[PDB]
């Protein structure tokens, strides 16, 4: 049968959002899965900046290379 390799959603930890690649807005909320080999960014509330690792390679499984990071926002 057909294998569903993919990353699920993340829920919006603090004050920030998620920087995907070939997605435009009023999407991003009822998705299933992204697609393996997805890198997204870690963006602080607004248009804030964060100096943190801020980069994440969606996996064959449920989840991202690195799920634990604590993105200071800094400008």
């Known amino acids: 049968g057909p294998t569903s390799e993919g990353c699920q ?16 807005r009023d999407q991003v909320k009822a998705i299933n899965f992204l697609p393996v ?23 064959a499984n449920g989840s991202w290379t690195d799920m634990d990071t604590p993105s200071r926002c800094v400008r």
């Open 37 to 59: 080999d997805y890198e997204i960014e870690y963006v602080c509330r607004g248009e804030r900046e964060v100096v943190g690792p801020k980069v994440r390679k969606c996996l």
């Open 9 to 24: 959603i993340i829920h919006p930890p603090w004050e920030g959002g998620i920087r995907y690649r070939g997605l435009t």
